[PDB]
Amino acid sequence: GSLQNIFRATSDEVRHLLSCDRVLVYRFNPDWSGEFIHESVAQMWEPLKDLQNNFPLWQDTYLQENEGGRYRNHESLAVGDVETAGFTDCHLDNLRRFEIRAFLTVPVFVGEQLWGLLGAYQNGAPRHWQAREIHLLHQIANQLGVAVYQAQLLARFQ
Amino acid sequence: GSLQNIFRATSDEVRHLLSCDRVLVYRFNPDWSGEFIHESVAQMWEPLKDLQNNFPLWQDTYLQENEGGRYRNHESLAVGDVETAGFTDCHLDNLRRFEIRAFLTVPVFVGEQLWGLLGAYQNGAPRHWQAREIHLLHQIANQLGVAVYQAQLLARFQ
Ligand SMILES: *[C@H](C)[C@H]1/C(=C/c2[nH]c(/C=C3N=C(/C=C4\NC(=O)C(CC)=C4C)C(C)=C\3CCC(=O)O)c(CCC(=O)O)c2C)NC(=O)[C@@H]1C
Numbered sequence: 673g674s675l676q677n678i679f680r681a682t683s684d685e686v687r688h689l690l691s692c693d694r695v696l697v698y699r700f701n702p703d704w705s706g707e708f709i710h711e712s713v714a715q716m717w718e719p720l721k722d723l724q725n726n727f728p729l730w731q732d733t734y735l736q737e738n739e740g741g742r743y744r745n746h747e748s749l750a751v752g753d754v755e756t757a758g759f760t761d762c763h764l765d766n767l768r769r770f771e772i773r774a775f776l777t778v779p780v781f782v783g784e785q786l787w788g789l790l791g792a793y794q795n796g797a798p799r800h801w802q803a804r805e806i807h808l809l810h811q812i813a814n815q816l817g818v819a820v821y822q823a824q825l826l827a828r829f830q
Numbered sequence: 831g832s833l834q835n836i837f838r839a840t841s842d843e844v845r846h847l848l849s850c851d852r853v854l855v856y857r858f859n860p861d862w863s864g865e866f867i868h869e870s871v872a873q874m875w876e877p878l879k880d881l882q883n884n885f886p887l888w889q890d891t892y893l894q895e896n897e898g899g900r901y902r903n904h905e906s907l908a909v910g911d912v913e914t915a916g917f918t919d920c921h922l923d924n925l926r927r928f929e930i931r932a933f934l935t936v937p938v939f940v941g942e943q944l945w946g947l948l949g950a951y952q953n954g955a956p957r958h959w960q961a962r963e964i965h966l967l968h969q970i971a972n973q974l975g976v977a978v979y980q981a982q983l984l985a986r987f988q
């Protein structure tokens with residue numbers, strides 16, 4: 673619950689600061705598949721989280737094959753319009769499925785590890801992401817990873 | 831000053847908890863030489879820090895050649911009596927110079943990086959370091975590294 677509070681605080685903060693439509697926290701599994709573990713979403717949009725607090729699966733073969741991809745280097749990806757990005761069909765279909773028109777996705781490092789990703793999404797319109805927003809999100813994610821690691825340090829020692 | 835407060839808090843905490851004679855924070859330079867940047871020492875012992883707040887040089891060729899040595903793996907070294915440890919003369923002479931009879935030295939990780947070391951020292955007598963003290967110091971150091979990284983995140987972004 674203490675972790676969910678941290679995810680909720682960060683995700684709502686992002687959504688508030690960037691005035692995006694949806695924020696997602698995605699956590700990598702050991703095999704580099706991953707799970708959504710938090711969503712902040714404006715009420716006008718169908719939420720990804722169902723009433724059991726389950727999420728849908730995004731089975732991203734590319735992240736998994738590349739063991740986190742660019743995010744291993746602490747890089748982000750900002751895409752203003754998914755429909756003009758030249759993506760592979762299976763990837764675009766998931767973007768469409770999750771009502772992602774434009775996204776800014778940054779890595780979450782927990783100590784030395786690429787623990788997950790933090791995504792900010794625009795749902796109804798493309799969005800030209802500014803350099804400052806990319807830099808800000810990256811900082812928010814670093815802060816989130818520190819919060820996560822701090823919580824782990826306290827939760828499991830004494 | 832905000833960093834010195836963190837070093838002072840941690841170092842005094844260690845010295846208090848382990849009832850050792852001296853605690854040192856050592857920070858690695860880019861070339862894996864290093865500098866002492868804080869000491870907590872019981873009043874009975876000559877301090878390493880002079881009145882200018884300068885420290886003496888410990889020019890450890892082995893740490894430097896091995897780019898941090900065992901500490902890169904997050905390992906510690908606990909030595910109960912330096913005089914029976916089989917050390918190389920140049921290393922033993924520095925131990926003697928700094929009035930180190932027994933030491934417990936752990937790595938300080940700042941995010942993904944081996945930033946430095948945290949050392950607890952007994953000055954006047956050997957000391958059998960217990961597994962629990964090794965495990966505790968390791969945790970204190972992880973916490974210190976998190977504090978350091980958090981301070982860096984806040985100091986240099988906005
Ligand atoms: C095809 C069978 C499947 C597929 C392929 C695929 N993915 C990518 C690139 C990425 N996939 C993602 C994943 C996410 N973005 C997010 O916002 C979230 C939630 C936080 C996830 C899980 C990301 C970020 C990228 C860019 C990665 C990078 O290192 O640059 C590719 C490469 C680009 C392309 O489309 O050609 C491919 C082929 N993804 C699926 O979902 C399919 C089922």
Ligand SMILES: *[C@H](C)[C@H]1/C(=C/c2[nH]c(/C=C3N=C(/C=C4\NC(=O)C(CC)=C4C)C(C)=C\3CCC(=O)O)c(CCC(=O)O)c2C)NC(=O)[C@@H]1C
Pocket residue numbers: 854855856864888889890891892893898899900901907916917918919920921922924933935947948949
């Ligand atoms: C010889 C010219 C010089 C030298 C050699 C040397 N050092 C080591 C091993 C270590 N040196 C240290 C350093 C410290 N211990 C501390 O508590 C602090 C302050 C925080 C420092 C800087 C450490 C921890 C080790 C163990 C490292 C590891 O990876 O295990 C060796 C190897 C062991 C040996 O003595 O044979 C050698 C040869 N050190 C000097 O100071 C000389 C000038």
